[PDB]
Structure 1
Amino acid sequence: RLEEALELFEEMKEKGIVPDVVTYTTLISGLGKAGRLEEALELFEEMKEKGIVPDVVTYTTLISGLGKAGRLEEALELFEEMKEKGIVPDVVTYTTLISGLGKAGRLEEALELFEEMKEKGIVPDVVTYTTLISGLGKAGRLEEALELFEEMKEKGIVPDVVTYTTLISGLGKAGRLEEALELFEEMKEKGIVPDVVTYTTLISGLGKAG
């Protein structure tokens, strides 16, 4: 029903009536959910133009959309602008930003955001942990990924196949076959299905030993 809502919004505009901030919030939110990001960006810029101040929901919506879009620099601009204007981000914003950062191999910036969100008492997702551990793993930083794995384990967050695959592959590469094996059995305990990579790494490591 977003077409009708927009139609009514423009018709409202035409009769020389100034919309409430709630209207902009609702429209931006709806267009955001609808995956119509560009229009929401238009509405946002219009909203900024009339001197109207946007709510947290608008910011989180736009940042999420840009994050999915891969336009990380803009999402960062919006994040900073959001912080300066005294708005407190929620878990979702940090999650999307760290996801994108990890994807772009900007690992230490993602670490900064993880620590910063840890400071403000935000609780990370399994997604955040897996993103960070995978990214750290691809970067050859196995020890930090191990620290993070233990930390993740302690807080009762359950890892998935990707984290195990990454850690096992890295351990195998490091020649720590026994550890990789207990990780293999531990991943067997929780019933996750291993990847061909894990099997080939393990078989190769075993092959070198005997």
Structure 2
Amino acid sequence: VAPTVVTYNALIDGLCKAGKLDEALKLFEEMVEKGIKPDEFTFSSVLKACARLGALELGKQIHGYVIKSGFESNVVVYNALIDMYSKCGLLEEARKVFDEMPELTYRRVVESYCRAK
């Protein structure tokens, strides 16, 4: 993997682990602005930050970005999308992502939704 993607992923992950979720999202924005290509680990970490912040709008923007980037089939990314929608209070959207995928149980999706409510 490209060293700059490694570096951004590690900083984003470290900021997430430190509970500095807004700072992780700021780094991700810069990554995209500078033309540095996120990978499935980038998307997973930043969608987790969105889920923990309730940043549904950025989560939906990332969803569109993932769809267009061919990450449509990626298990790591779709798990993170499901987690983001369920923790942002949109079980029906999490269900639609779940139904797109080819493990994860719907019980766990519902549990995540209920525990965030």
TM-score, normalized by length of structure 2?
Answer: 0.72
How do 1:160-171 and structure 2 match up within 5 A? 160=76, 162-170=79-87
Counterpart position of 2:104: 194
Query: Is the radius of gyration larger for structure 1 or structure 2?
Result: 1
What residue ranges of structure 1 are gaps of 5+ in the alignment? 1-88, 205-210
Distance in structure 2 (CA, Å) of the matches to 1:138 and 1:125: 20
Q: Is the 8 A contact 2:47 2:59 kept in 1?
A: yes
Counterpart position of 2:65: 151
What residue ranges of structure 2 are gaps of 5+ in the alignment? none
**3-state SS, counterpart of residue 54 of structure 2:** coil
Counterpart position of 1:20: none
The CA deviation at 1:166 is 0.6
1:131 aligns with 2:48: no
Q: 1:100 to 1:201 in 2, by over 3 A?
A: closer
How do 1:47-126 and structure 2 match up within 5 A? 90-126=4-40
The CA deviation at 1:95 is 1.2
Aligned residue identity for 1:198: V
Larger mean CA deviation between 104-113 and 156-165 belongs to 156-165
Structure 1 vs Structure 2 CA RMSD:
2.6
Distance in structure 2 (CA, Å) of the matches to 1:164 and 1:110: 17
**3-state SS, counterpart of residue 123 of structure 1:** coil
TM-score, normalized by length of structure 1?
Answer: 0.44
Distance in structure 2 (CA, Å) of the matches to 1:128 and 1:201: 21
Size of the aligned set, in residue pairs, is: 108
Aligned residue identity for 1:194: L
The CA deviation at 1:91 is 1.7
Counterpart position of 1:183: 97
